[model samples]
Target: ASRIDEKSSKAKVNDFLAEIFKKIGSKENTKEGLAELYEYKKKYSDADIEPFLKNSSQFFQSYVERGLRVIEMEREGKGRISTSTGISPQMEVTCVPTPTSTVSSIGNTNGEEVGPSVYLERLKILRQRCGLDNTKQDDRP
Candidate 1:
C-alpha cells in the first residue's frame, strides 16, 4: 500500500472563490457594514417580521449591484494606478513560473486532489487563468 498525506481537499471543488469570498464579505458587511441584507422571508402577508418583513422590500440588492459598478468605477477611475502599459515586463524574470512540494509523494488515487498549505501561488495563477485573466495581454494586441 502506498501513502498519501491526509491532504484534506481542494477549494477548486467549490468554484469561483473570489465570488464566494465577495459573497461572504457581502453578508458579513450587511451586518458588520450595517442593516443591509434582506429583512424578511416574506412567508406570509399576515405574518410576523421574524417570519416575514418584506426583506426583498425593494432595499438591499439595488445598492448591492450599484456599489459594485461604482467600486469598479473608482478602482479603474477615481483612484487609478500610477502605472502604464509601458511598465516593462521585469516579470519576464517571472516570464516563466516556478514550483514546490519536494516531498516523497504517493499515488494520488483520489480523483479529488486535496489541499496543501504552501502551493497556491501557481494554483492561483491557474485559477485566474481559469477565469478571464488576459486583460493586459489582450489589450497588448
Candidate 2:
C-alpha cells in the first residue's frame, strides 16, 4: 500500500510537469499561469517539486520574455512578432504561382504586387512554427 501511494504521488507530479510544459508552449507563461503552477506545487513535497521547478523556471522565464518581446514589438509597429523559447522575430513566406502564366508571378494590384498583411504574416509564421497551421482555412470557419 505504501509503494502504491508513492507511485501515485510520482505520477501526479509527472502530470503536473506535463501540464506546465504545454502551458509554456502555448505562450501562457503569464502571471496567472505561474500562479496556477505554484498552486499545483503545493500538492507535493518540496523535494519532489524542487528539481522540476528549477528546470521549469528557466523555461518559463525565457517563454515569458519572448511573449513580452512580442508585445513590445507590436507597440513599436513591428507587427505581432513571436518567438519560441527566445525573444527574436523571424520572417517567413510562401508563394504560389499563377496557373495561367508561363512565368510564375505574384499578381499585382495597381502595379504593386499583392502581398500578405504584415501582422498576419508574422502570426502565420508563429502558428506554423507551433504546428498550429496544419490546415489552411478560409475566413468561413
Candidate 3:
C-alpha cells in the first residue's frame, strides 16, 4: 500500500513538471519557469528535483543556442535558415516595371488620357501584391 502511494505521488510530480514545460513554450521564459518550479521543490525529494532541474536547464540552453546559430548563419550570408518552430527571415520583394508604364505613372489616376487609367490599375495591383492595402478594419471606437 505504501509503495503504491509513493508511485502515485511520483507520477503526480512528473505530471507537474510536464505542465511547467508545456506552459514555458520557448527558452525565453526558462528562467522564470525554473524559478516557479523551485518553489515546489519542497514537495518532492532532492533526488527528484535536482535531476529535473539539471536536465531542464540543459535542454533550454541548447535550444536557445541553436536558434542563435541560425541567426548568425543568416548574417554570414549562408542563405536563410529555417527552424523547426517555423520561423525564418522574410524574403525581399522588388517592384519590377511592367511593359505597360513607367514608375512615374503610379499615382496619376485622374489625368487627360486613357494611359493614366491603365497606370492606376497597375498601381492598385502592385499595392496589393506588396501588402500595402488598407483593407483591414480599425479597432478604435
Candidate 4:
C-alpha cells in the first residue's frame, strides 16, 4: 500500500498465464495447471493471490476458453475424420450446412449485433424524456 511502483506479482502472474495455459494445453488439463499457478505464487509472491485472482477471474476464464478451443478443435477434427470414413456419402451431404458459428461463439460474449443506431435511439429517447427536445425549439433564437 505504501509504494506506487513496488511492482507486485499480479502483473507477473497475469502475463505469465499465456505460457501457463498453453503449457497445460487445455481445460481438462488445467487441474494440474491451477496447482502450479498457486505454487509459483506461493514460492515467489508474498502478495495476496486470491484477491488478485478474484478481480481477474474473467480474464482467466478467457484463457480457459482458449485452452478448450485449442484442444477441442483437435478432437473434433479427428472425430470428423473417423466419422466421415464410416459414412462417406452422408458426411459430404451434411457438411454443406456446417456453420462457422459453432466454433466462433463463446458463452460470455454479448451484443454482437447492437449497431450504432441503437445507441443514438436510446440517446434520442433519453433526450425526449429529459424535456430538452421541446425546450430546444423555443430556445433556438
Candidate 5:
C-alpha cells in the first residue's frame, strides 16, 4: 500500500487547482474552474483527489447559483416593502427604499442562521441534478 504525505498532497492539490484556475481564465475560480481541474487531474493517481473535487465543485456551484438568484431577486424588486394607504390627501404609493437596499437590509437579518451542512446537502442534491445548488453566497457587508 502507498500513502501520500498530507502536507505535500495539499500543496500539490492547491497548485493543481491554481493551474486549472489559470486555464479557465478566472481569478477567483468557481465550480466551472473545478470542472477543468477534474479533467486535468486525470494525469495523476490520487485517491483523495476525487472526493474533494466532487464536493468542492458542488459547493462552489451552489454559491454561483445563489449569486445568480440574488441578482435576479434584485432585478425583480423582491424584498421587504413598506405599504402605506391614504384617502384624504391622495392615493399615492411609493417604494420606501430601492429593491437593492431592501434586499441588502433584509439580507441575513437572522443571526442564528443554519450552518453550511444544510447548504452542503442542498448542493449535493443540486450537483446530482442540475449541476448547481440553490444556496446564498456570502456577500454580506
Candidate 6:
C-alpha cells in the first residue's frame, strides 16, 4: 500500500477549485468550496497540509463575508455599514457601545493568569455540573 501524494494531488485539485470560483462566482461558492477542500486535505498524513488547508478555509470564509458586507452597505445607502454578522435579508443589525463601561488599563485588573491545568480543572467541574463525562470536554485545552 502506498501513501497519497498530496502535493501533486493538490495542484490538480486547486485547478478545479479555480475553475469553480471563476464560473460560479466567488461570492456564491468560495466558502463551501474551500470547506470541501479542507476536508480532502485532512485525509492525508502530511504534517504541513492540515494547517495550509485550515488557513485556506478561513480565508474563503472571511472573503465571502466581506463581499456580503459590501453588497449590504451599498443596498442600505452610503455611510451605513454592517454592524453584526453578515447581512442577510431576514436579519437587521445595529451596533453601539454601551454608554456606561469605563475603559480600563491592562495593569489595573484583579485578573489572574492560569495555565491549562487550571482550565482543565474548571472544565471538569463544569462538565460534572452539566452531567457530561471528561471525554466530552473540548480538545483544544
lDDT of 1 at 59: 62
lDDT of 4: 0.50
Pairs that clash in candidate 3? none
Per-prediction TM-score = 0.21, 0.29, 0.28, 0.26, 0.24, 0.22
RMSD of each: 22.7, 17.0, 20.8, 14.4, 16.4, 15.7
Which candidate, 2 or 5, would have the higher lDDT against the true structure?
A: 2
lDDT string for model 3 (15-97, tens) is 66755554345355444344444445435534575445465667664553344344445547664653345323334644642
Please list the residue runs of candidate 5 whose C-alpha ends up more than 4 Å from where it truly belongs after superposition: 1-4, 25-39, 45-48, 54-58, 61-141
True-vs-predicted CA distance for residue 79, candidate 3, Å: 40
After superposition, the stretches of candidate 4 with alpha carbons farther than 4 Å from their true spots are 1-3, 7-9, 17-25, 41-47, 58-141
Task: Give the Cα lDDT of each candidate.
Answer: 0.36, 0.50, 0.50, 0.50, 0.47, 0.46
- Per-residue lDDT tens digits of candidate 1, residues 19-80? 32233244533331211122121123213222112333356445554543444444465546
What digit string (tens of lDDT, one per residue) describes model 6 on residues 59-88? 654554344445445556665554555333
lDDT, candidate 2, residue 113? 42
Report the lDDT tens digits of candidate 5 across residue range 2-113: 3656667677677655444443444433444444444444456435455454645566544433443444444466653323442222236654533444344454635436
Full ranking by TM-score: 2, 3, 4, 5, 6, 1
lDDT for 104 in candidate 6 is 28
Q: Select the stronger candidate by lDDT from 1 and 3.
A: 3
Q: How many residue pairs clash in each candidate?
A: 3, 0, 0, 0, 0, 0
- Worst window of 10 by summed lDDT in candidate 5: 81-90
**Model 4: per-residue lDDT, tens digit, 1-141?**
437544655566665654454435545535445445545655767254455445654666455434444454454575644544332233445744544564345666355355555434544554455456554445755
Per the 3 Å backbone cut-off, how many clashing residue pairs does candidate 1 have?
3
Q: Candidate 2 on 35-139: residue-level lDDT in tens?
A: 445545445433565555465557555554345445444547654553344322324533632343443357546632433343244345544666665666688
**Per-residue lDDT for 69 in model 2?**
44
Over the full model, what C-alpha lDDT does candidate 1 score relative to the true structure? 0.36
User: Model 1 compared with the native: what TM-score?
Assistant: 0.21
User: How good is model 2 by TM-score?
Assistant: 0.29
